[PDB]
């Protein structure tokens, strides 16, 4: 199927508490394989998936060296952005970076992306063309001009279309038994009466991988989109996900309702009735 | 801006009394990243609680999983105590095993 490799970076200044913190998380689809935390004792890029452990010391040395070099870029950027926005030296500010690349079933490049935020708002983004930048304000316009002059898009595109896809392809092959697997949802329904007039019908999807799932309630064929309570997909802790969808039904009409489960682990969508 | 955390207190596997499991606290959709999360057993702080590595969503808001190995009993009460700039007082969310 379709696959992706994504890296998430968070840089937080904490004036007076400590040094700016840096967390780097690496993902292949919905599986984390690497981590770096400036607060942790190792000061190395650490393995978080079993299929990355087979990578030699030169991989680990390279990743540490490079993720350290990035944290240093982000530390000077925290200072640069405080200066752009005329913010106080005593406030806490946060830079967030996400980049990655997608491959199809053939293993060929699909899309590449690079997005940056400052204080939870868009800052600068690499455009779909991988050739230009979109600055969200006057300050991100200064950065845009720096990056245009430094040929940052050429550097980013060469990585996303080359090195990123070549690494993703290696990870998918080494991690085949887990990465190239789908776990279908283990569905069940539960009845929770509210009164003599109404009751709750909760549809559960547990143990599924990847996290993408659609739970839909229907009544005689019509979707109940406006009246379905949906929880956010949550991690089970073992690499799988959980989700539920609930709907309040009139006491003698439970049989008029069906829940539709859509997952790539399922060859045909499921339909649950009480 | 500043976004309030969303809290979910649940177990890895469906709860069976006297059977070993994992108690999860999933905090999501918050900004800034600075947060305090404690897992409690009868209002008392659980000593060894592990957490995931900080990540974020399409809106830039963060998420984290805090977990501990626990064995659910019939009478023992479990909860999550969360603190964030966004809260007047830390928020206690109790573990409802039918959620």
């Amino acid at each position: 199927g379709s696959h992706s490799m994504r890296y998430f970076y968070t840089s937080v200044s904490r004036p007076g508490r400590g040094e700016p913190r840096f967390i780097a998380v690496g993902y292949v689809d919905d599986t984390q394989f690497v981590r770096f935390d400036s607060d942790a004792a190792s000061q190395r890029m650490e393995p978080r998936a079993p299929w990355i452990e087979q990578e030699g010391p030169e991989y680990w040395d390279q990743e540490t060296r490079n993720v350290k070099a990035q944290s240093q870029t982000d530390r000077v950027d925290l200072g640069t952005l405080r200066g752009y926005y005329n913010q106080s030296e005593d406030g806490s500010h946060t830079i967030q970076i996400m980049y990655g690349c997608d491959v199809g079933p053939d293993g060929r490049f699909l899309r590449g992306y690079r997005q940056d935020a400052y204080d939870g708002k868009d800052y600068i983004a690499l455009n779909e063309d991988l050739r230009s930048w979109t600055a969200a304000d006057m300050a991100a316009q200064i950065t845009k001009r720096k990056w245009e002059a430094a040929h940052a898009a050429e550097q980013q595109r060469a990585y996303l279309e080359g090195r990123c896809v070549e690494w993703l392809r290696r990870y998918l092959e080494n991690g085949k038994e887990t990465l190239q697997r789908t776990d279908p949802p283990k569905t069940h329904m539960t009845h929770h009466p509210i009164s003599d007039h109404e009751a709750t019908l909760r549809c559960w999807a547990l143990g599924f991988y990847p996290a993408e799932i659609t739970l839909t309630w229907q009544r005689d064929g019509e979707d109940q989109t406006q009246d379905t309570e949906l929880v956010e997909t949550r991690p089970a802790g073992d690499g799988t996900f959980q989700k539920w969808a609930a709907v309040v039904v009139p006491s003698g009409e439970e049989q008029r309702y069906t829940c539709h489960v859509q997952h790539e682990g399922l060859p045909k969508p499921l339909t649950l009735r009480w | 801006i500043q976004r309030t955390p969303k809290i979910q207190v649940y177990s890895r596997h469906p709860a069976e009394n006297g059977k070993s499991n994992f108690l999860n606290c999933y905090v999501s959709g918050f900004h800034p990243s600075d947060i305090e999360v404690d897992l409690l057993k009868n209002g008392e702080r659980i000593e060894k609680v592990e957490h995931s590595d900080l990540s974020f969503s399409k809106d830039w808001s963060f998420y984290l999983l805090y977990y501990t190995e626990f064995t659910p009993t019939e009478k023992d009460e479990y909860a999550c105590r969360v603190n964030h700039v966004t809260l007047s007082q830390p928020k206690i969310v109790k573990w409802d095993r039918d959620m």
Partner: antibody
Amino acid sequence: EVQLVQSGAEVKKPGASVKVSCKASGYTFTGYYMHWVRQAPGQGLEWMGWINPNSGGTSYAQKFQGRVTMTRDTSTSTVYMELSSLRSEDTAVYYCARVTTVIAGPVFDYWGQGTLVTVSS
Amino acid sequence: AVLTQPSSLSASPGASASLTCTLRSGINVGPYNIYWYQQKPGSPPQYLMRYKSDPDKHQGSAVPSRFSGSKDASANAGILLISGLQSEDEADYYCMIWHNNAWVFGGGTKLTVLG
């Protein structure tokens, strides 16, 4: 409850060194940075620097740079502050103060009881 | 000194004491978070409040509403106002700011409640 318990009073001579301990309890020791603040008898407060008890990373105030060492023992939940090449001007009560992770109000939230270090020829 | 506090202030029970924390000229009070810590004899210092501005402040859960923070921009100062003074309010009061890559304290003010 969070409790920070420090070692007993010390009497030292100029040029010597002092090692002050601070045993932490009632929280995850590695999750919070520990700072040191001193108070000269009948005077004000002076910040010395911090330790990350997880990494062992430190930062000292310009005045103590070269003379202070902050260390920790994760196994015993203890932080240590060691001031060397001591002078009578170093006579003070030395506090260890935990710093919050949530940035909203307090910085130093929990303090030790203090350790009096008397420097005298 | 960066932060200068009066050494002492005295006031009667039931009255109001206005404790000042003045910032040195050319260092504007406005942008900074001013922290107040209270110190009772033989005890370590204790947080009272953080004040940047009326929409950016914090007060400890155990700190009564009769303790309040402001800033007097004209004086370039931080203020801790203690109303309806009590005997338990007799203590040393330090103000602090994060300035020039270090925690900076004022000398402290000894507050005496005239009982």
